[PDB]
Design an enzyme around this catalytic site. Structure first.
Site, PDB file in Angstrom:
ATOM      1  N   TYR A 111      47.304  34.795  41.698  1.00 33.00           N
ATOM      2  CA  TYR A 111      47.716  36.211  40.876  1.00 33.00           C
ATOM      3  C   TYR A 111      48.652  35.949  39.847  1.00 33.00           C
ATOM      4  O   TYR A 111      48.969  36.771  39.071  1.00 33.00           O
ATOM      5  CB  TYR A 111      48.521  37.303  41.809  1.00 33.00           C
ATOM      6  N   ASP A 168      35.286  38.147  45.808  1.00 32.80           N
ATOM      7  CA  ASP A 168      36.632  38.577  45.382  1.00 32.80           C
ATOM      8  C   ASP A 168      37.314  37.494  44.360  1.00 32.80           C
ATOM      9  O   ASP A 168      36.628  37.260  43.471  1.00 32.80           O
ATOM     10  CB  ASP A 168      37.609  38.817  46.591  1.00 32.80           C
ATOM     11  N   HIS A 191      35.409  46.656  51.188  1.00 35.63           N
ATOM     12  CA  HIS A 191      36.016  45.406  50.137  1.00 35.63           C
ATOM     13  C   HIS A 191      35.390  44.216  50.967  1.00 35.63           C
ATOM     14  O   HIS A 191      35.023  43.197  50.155  1.00 35.63           O
ATOM     15  CB  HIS A 191      37.032  45.116  49.833  1.00 35.63           C
TER      16      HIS A 191
HETATM   17  O1  LIG Z   1      43.069  41.611  43.993  1.00 39.42           O
HETATM   18  C1  LIG Z   1      41.973  41.482  43.981  1.00 39.42           C
HETATM   19  N1  LIG Z   1      41.439  41.910  45.164  1.00 39.42           N
HETATM   20  C2  LIG Z   1      42.096  42.162  46.425  1.00 39.42           C
HETATM   21  C3  LIG Z   1      41.704  41.490  47.610  1.00 39.42           C
HETATM   22  C4  LIG Z   1      42.384  41.767  48.927  1.00 39.42           C
HETATM   23  C5  LIG Z   1      43.254  42.742  48.579  1.00 39.42           C
HETATM   24  C6  LIG Z   1      43.727  43.553  47.739  1.00 39.42           C
HETATM   25  C7  LIG Z   1      42.897  43.331  46.505  1.00 39.42           C
HETATM   26  C8  LIG Z   1      44.593  44.634  47.919  1.00 39.42           C
HETATM   27  C9  LIG Z   1      45.085  45.448  47.092  1.00 39.42           C
HETATM   28  C10 LIG Z   1      46.261  46.479  47.508  1.00 39.42           C
HETATM   29  C11 LIG Z   1      46.608  46.317  48.926  1.00 39.42           C
HETATM   30  C12 LIG Z   1      46.036  45.333  49.916  1.00 39.42           C
HETATM   31  C13 LIG Z   1      44.951  44.711  49.489  1.00 39.42           C
HETATM   32  S1  LIG Z   1      44.328  43.246  50.214  1.00 39.42           S
HETATM   33  O2  LIG Z   1      45.380  42.327  50.650  1.00 39.42           O
HETATM   34  O3  LIG Z   1      43.392  44.007  51.139  1.00 39.42           O
HETATM   35  N2  LIG Z   1      41.171  41.176  42.972  1.00 39.42           N
HETATM   36  C14 LIG Z   1      41.811  41.059  41.762  1.00 39.42           C
HETATM   37  C15 LIG Z   1      41.283  39.660  41.191  1.00 39.42           C
HETATM   38  C16 LIG Z   1      39.479  39.774  41.230  1.00 39.42           C
HETATM   39  F1  LIG Z   1      39.258  40.634  40.106  1.00 39.42           F
HETATM   40  F2  LIG Z   1      39.338  38.562  40.759  1.00 39.42           F
HETATM   41  C17 LIG Z   1      39.167  40.067  42.607  1.00 39.42           C
HETATM   42  C18 LIG Z   1      39.641  41.223  43.069  1.00 39.42           C
END
Ligand SMILES: O=C(Nc1ccc2c(c1)-c1ccccc1S2(=O)=O)N1CCC(F)(F)CC1
Ligand SMILES: O=C(Nc1ccc2c(c1)-c1ccccc1S2(=O)=O)N1CCC(F)(F)CC1
Lengths: 546, 546
Positions: free
Chosen positions: A465, A334, A523
């Site tokens: 983020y 991730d 995931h």
């Molecule tokens: O945002 C992520 N993953 C990620 C990790 C954990 C969750 C989500 C997204 C997500 C998204 C929507 C709802 C709940 C959740 S969650 O809290 O289950 N990434 C962006 C940057 C990257 F590309 F480096 C790796 C992937």
């Protein structure tokens, strides 16, 4: 009424037995039957072998006494030993050949899981041979699965003396009728039977497991393959390094050999690698599992710019410097996977090899701000929700148990609306207040994450983020480079955010990239399909990172 | 008025220079003079080499562009390159040959010690070759001795562009007339001279050091050899392992390679190995320096029997198990040396090699209690004084600064009556209340020990002396054994308690024992003669423990 099971090492937990080699050596050398076994037992309680098993002498001191015993035995048999006869050569090959009897160990682990006390009681020696490490490794792997290890050479007693059985009962705090005893040597069972213990003579594994099933009432044969062994947080070595004033990183460490650094994602912990840590250490690696900056026992400063990729990668280089490591293999998942690609692009000398689970390498577009790319896609609407400081924190910190129970779920157990998060007003607006427990995690595992996030909250983790523009500007400096060090990309079939088709153009940037693919995986890769992850990583490490 | 010194890496801190190899390659291959140097610079600011030094491309991407440049240059010179011509082969050999210029580094360290800010400013590349580890190791060794490291490929600028000199001045927070700049390439000095900096053209080391001496007013050439590099406690990786409930061990860790465990004596700390820790890590070892049980950040339970040898050795085995180490080299001093001999006698599988500083291996006498042996000798009267709980604690804890200042002294600076301690009524009865500082230690080093002993006092450490009978009974079980694993005994000529002649019969028990001897050395071996200790240990580790 049984509540304890005792196993021997030689011939029971490890195969083949040493005595088995003495008989096979006799047949191969055309020696009289039983000759080497007679020299081995020569003298009984007063003989050299009993002194060895009681710890009076070491293995290297016993070898020439055993060689002398072989000559006295050959003289009375009227035969001559071959000119190239060597007890050391024979014993060295026998000890090397001995491997763990996997179904016997699996039965021991199943009984322990069902409440039994388990122990190893063995006649063994103080090994001081140059090759003694092979034995030390065997004992280390076994000892972590049992409650007790009683070795004859440490207690000064041997089987079949009746006092070792009394010593065992005192250690177990149990009466003989509550104990099952497994041994491949009949004479060693007799004293345990006289005391009232249930005994099982081990000749072949399957028959011994059938007798064990019958007497304990637990199914041991034909059972589903267990999950890999997992960490207990309180048994780990905890490491702390200050990389900057007010920035300290915490890590967990296990094993020896080439260093491997594990980098978790959002919103996770070093604990997300609990199934990989013992497997990678056993495969011959020194594993360092980090609490990334903003998480668990690592420092969590409040400023947004403390979490941009440039700062994070630089602190990871300082971490290797303070530990005295010129290189490490970097494995990420991730947000951690995103970081390991940037480590390989900016610091290749420090990266022995790079692997990412789910996260593809996506190069920056110099013609478009990452904010516009995110707005031109509905699957990344959650990233816009995470932008405003304080908003997602209040929702995610409101009830920690609900937060982790809702996020940590398999692909078919989802309970979250992934689209129109901003329109809806939150991540959990159409979600139940008390979600059910997923099949991937236990309540005890969820509570570990709850405890860790009680310390610093979601500010640090969410700030990863909040640097889209700063990270984009920094990544634009590497557009002319290629990743030419050993690399592995692992895709997960059912990841909702990071779909496998997002990785398809990686070969243009990493021309010798190796791939892995995990079917029916969501995931949370490490805890969803732990056996599959371990096998893909170990195979790649042994060939490309050795 | 100078207060900062800037050095180049290639040709200044590391020899020989890369350009030097291009010229030597031309002569060896009978190529036209300057041909490889012309291909290297082909294109100026627009050429391949400038893109490499600015971080636009990596070393492996540049190699075929340099090979193409060599062909274009050969065509205009009307010559043919040999059939076996390879830029990779030439660059690989050049990078491997480069070693640290020891007198240049020593001058940099002397200036830093006298208050100067030191920095490296170099034109370098993103090395992604399979052999890149050799370069990473070189950079790690150098970077720990300088305040700043500025690499062209990380900042996107190169020498001689004037903006890199402005960037350097902003980083140093100094005006150009306060900076000395050393470089072997004349063109790189010109911009620094235009700004007003003092410049030194490096052709040969001695002449450059003479110019540096003249301009700084500090003696750099013909100076005494400095002490080895020492640890800063706040820059170390700190590790914590729970071996038992309420028993946690603290350690400091540095390096990669075979594990080496350092075990201190009484009344010391992990800090007593401060001069050995960086030297052993640089020699290719993973060093673990312990706070033994009862000391510093390790647990200090009050019960006497928690400090008998049997319990201490067992906890050291549990420490290796929880860290996932099948073996370690054990090196001890004083009480730690006594412990490492017992580790080799009782757990040889876990001990790769064993070394003791000052402490000989003395086997137990089954005919006489150790209390009687101690009473039949006046040099061990202090051991009887240490027996009664509370007595030596009150005297040693009364003034911690006086305690450490009185104990930590060279053989010719002694201030303690070693005999009739019981008759006199204490260790410090005929001692000054404010003793002078010994030449071995600084006030800052003494205060580290003072701070550590403020936490748990002397109860734990003194309890190591209160198990004479328990240790004697346990040691009697090993009288039939011999130590047959690699072993080293190091004697110290002027140790008052542990005289070299107490070790003379060790060969009867350890027949292949290797020896070391340090002249003019007192009891505190590691800090008395650190260079001599490092050399004896490194030589023995490389031959007998590899
Ligand atoms: O945002 C992520 N993953 C990620 C990790 C954990 C969750 C989500 C997204 C997500 C998204 C929507 C709802 C709940 C959740 S969650 O809290 O289950 N990434 C962006 C940057 C990257 F590309 F480096 C790796 C992937
Ligand atoms: O007592 C020791 N050493 C030792 C260590 C440190 C100090 C003394 C002795 C001592 C003796 C008398 C006065 C002051 C001091 S002191 O506080 O400077 N040993 C016995 C057990 C062993 F053999 F294991 C190793 C050596």
């Amino acid at each position: 009424t049984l509540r304890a099971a005792v196993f021997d090492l030689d011939g029971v937990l490890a195969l083949p037995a040493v005595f088995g080699v003495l008989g096979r050596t006799e047949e191969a050398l055309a020696l009289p039957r039983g000759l080497l076994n007679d020299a081995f037992q020569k003298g009984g309680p007063e003989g050299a072998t009993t002194r060895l098993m009681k710890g009076e002498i070491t293995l290297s001191q016993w070898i020439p006494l055993m060689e002398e015993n072989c000559r006295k035995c050959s003289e009375t048999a009227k035969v001559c030993l071959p000119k190239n006869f060597s007890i050391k050569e024979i014993f060295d090959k026998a000890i090397s050949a001995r491997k763990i009897n996997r179904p016997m160990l699996q039965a021991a682990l199943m009984l322990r899981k069902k409440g039994f006390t388990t122990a190893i009681l063995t006649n063994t020696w103080l090994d001081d041979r140059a090759e003694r490490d092979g034995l030390a490794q065997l004992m280390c792997e076994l000892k972590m699965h049992f409650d007790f290890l009683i070795e004859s050479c440490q207690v000064g007693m041997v089987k079949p003396e009746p006092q070792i059985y009394k010593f065992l009962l005192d250690t177990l705090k149990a009466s003989p009728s509550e104990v099952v005893f497994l041994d491949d040597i009949g004479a060693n069972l007799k004293p345990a039977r006289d005391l009232g213990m249930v005994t099982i003579l081990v000749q072949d594994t399957d028959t011994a497991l059938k007798e064990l099933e019958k007497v304990t009432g637990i199914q041991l044969l034909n059972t589903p393959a267990p999950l890999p062994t997992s960490c207990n947080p309180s048994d780990m070595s905890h490491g702390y390094v200050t990389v900057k004033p007010r920035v300290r990183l915490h890590f967990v460490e296990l094993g020896s050999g080439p260093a491997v650094c594990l980098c978790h994602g959002f919103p996770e912990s070093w604990y997300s690698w609990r199934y990989q840590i013992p497997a990678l250490a056993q495969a011959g690696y020194r594993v360092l599992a980090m609490d990334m900056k903003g998480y668990g026992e690592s420092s969590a400063p409040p400023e947004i710019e403390e979490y941009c990729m440039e700062v994070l990668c630089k602190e990871m280089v300082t971490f290797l410097d303070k530990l005295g490591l010129s290189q490490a293999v970097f494995i990420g998942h991730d947000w951690g996977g995103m970081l390991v690609w940037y480590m390989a692009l900016f610091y290749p000398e420090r990266v022995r090899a790079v692997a990412s689970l789910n996260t593809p390498f996506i190069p920056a577009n110099p013609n478009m701000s990452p904010l516009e790319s995110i707005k031109a896609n509905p699957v990344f609407d959650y990233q816009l929700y995470f932008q405003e400081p304080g908003v997602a924190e209040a929702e995610l910190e409101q009830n920690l148990s609900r937060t982790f129970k809702s996020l940590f779920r398999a692909s078919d157990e989802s309970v979250l609306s992934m689209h129109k998060v901003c329109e809806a007003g939150g991540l959990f607006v159409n979600s139940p207040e008390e979600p059910s427990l997923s099949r991937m995690v236990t309540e005890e595992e969820i509570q570990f994450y709850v405890q860790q996030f009680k310390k610093s909250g979601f500010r640090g983790p969410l700030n990863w983020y909040r640097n889209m523009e700063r990270n984009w500007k920094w990544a634009c400096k590497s557009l002319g480079r290629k990743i030419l060090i050993p690399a592995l990309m692992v895709t997960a079939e059912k990841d909702f955010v990071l779909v496998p088709q997002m990785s398809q153009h990686m070969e243009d940037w990493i021309p010798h990239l190796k791939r892995g693919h995990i079917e029916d995986c969501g995931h949370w890769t490490q805890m969803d399909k732990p056996t599959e992850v371990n096998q893909i990583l170990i195979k790649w490490l042994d060939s490309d990172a050795r």
